[PDB]
Design a binder for this molecule. Structure first.
Ligand SMILES: CC[N+](CC)(CC)Cc1ccccc1
Ligand SMILES: [Mg+2]
Ligand SMILES: [Mg+2]
Ligand SMILES: [Mg+2]
Ligand code: NA
Length: 304
């Protein structure tokens, strides 16, 4: 209980999500808010006017402060800056109304801030930074190539969606915040464990960001499991959302199973991998609680 405080997740209406996941909130949240502010200022300086919220949420906690509550305080500002640029660039990648001329116009500014992120990370922790650069580029490239694929099942969708939502990229940021690197063997084995975590994160995002993504569908590619379920099963919004809610609960339980299965088969586990597992579980609770009222998805929490 050094970088963060335990928060009782049962004080929030999580719609049955998050059972058996503990919630923590970083004590240095101000540093995350600072990173978000600076990234937003840099976006206006080099790219254009801001159109939306990113990770800030002063009520339930800045995204980085609740998703990555074990971050070293000296790394939290940079991580929040990187994620804020990712939140804003994400909407650019999904956009459909950008003229070719505007796309060309933004490119060098987006490149400047991308490279600024990578260079600052590399100067801080070269090993950890290389994993962030690799996963970020994979997320950007996969979104760009595959965002209009017509998926015919949630299972197929999720193999794209875990990359499109940047789950491996956030994992690489989390490791950076811990000052942690994994061996090639740990990487191989932990990938199996964290797959259901990535699915739960992506589907939870879909659940809480659906309304906003429909509001934007006139200018933005719709990438959302609730819509897939509506189409495949001919269901309305609340019924499809219930299916997605049940599916999140399935993946949440699966991740807890795989953590304990790893301990039972490949254990006693090191303190390092123990902290890795715990840190991954905090992404689930933090993502969930942040999404309930973040201004990005919830219009009556917006200002400015
Ligand atoms: C909602 C935030 N994010 C990453 C920036 C996409 C914009 C998806 C994500 C959520 C939680 C964990 C990992 C990825
Ligand atoms: Mg996206
Ligand atoms: Mg998006
Ligand atoms: Mg979304
Ligand atoms: Na969209």
């Amino acid at each position: 209980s050094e970088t963060s405080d335990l928060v009782d997740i049962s004080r929030f209406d999580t719609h049955g999500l998050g059972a058996n996941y503990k919630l923590r909130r970083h004590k240095f949240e101000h540093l995350a808010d600072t990173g978000c502010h600076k990234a937003r200022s840099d976006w206006v300086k080099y790219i254009g006017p801001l159109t939306e919220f990113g990770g800030c949420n002063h009520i339930n906690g800045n995204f980085s402060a609740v998703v990555l509550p074990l971050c070293r305080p000296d790394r939290l500002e940079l991580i929040a800056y990187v994620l804020e640029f990712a939140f804003l660039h994400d909407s650019v990648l999904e956009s459909e109304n950008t003229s070719p001329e505007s796309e060309v116009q933004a490119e060098a500014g987006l490149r400047l801030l991308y490279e600024r992120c990578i260079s600052r990370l590399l100067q801080t922790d070269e090993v950890c930074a290389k994993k962030i650069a690799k996963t970020w580029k994979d997320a950007i490239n996969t979104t760009t190539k595959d965002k209009n694929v017509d998926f015919q099942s949630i299972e197929d969708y999720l193999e794209f969606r875990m990359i499109d939502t940047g789950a491996p990229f956030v994992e690489a940021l989390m490791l950076f915040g811990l000052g942690m690197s994994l061996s090639p063997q740990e990487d191989d084995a932990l990938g199996h464990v964290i797959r259901p975590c990535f699915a739960a994160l992506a589907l939870t995002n879909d659940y809480f960001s659906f309304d906003r993504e429909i509001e934007e569908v006139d200018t933005s590619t719709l990438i959302n499991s609730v819509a897939i379920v509506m189409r495949i099963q001919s269901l309305d919004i609340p019924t499809a959302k219930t299916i997605i809610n049940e599916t999140i609960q399935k993946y949440e339980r699966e991740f807890l199973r795989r953590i304990d299965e790893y301990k039972q088969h490949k254990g006693p586990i090191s303190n390092k991998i123990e902290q890795y597992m715990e840190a991954m579980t905090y992404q689930i609770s933090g993502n969930l609680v942040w999404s309930l009222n973040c201004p990005r998805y919830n219009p009556d929490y917006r200002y400015g």
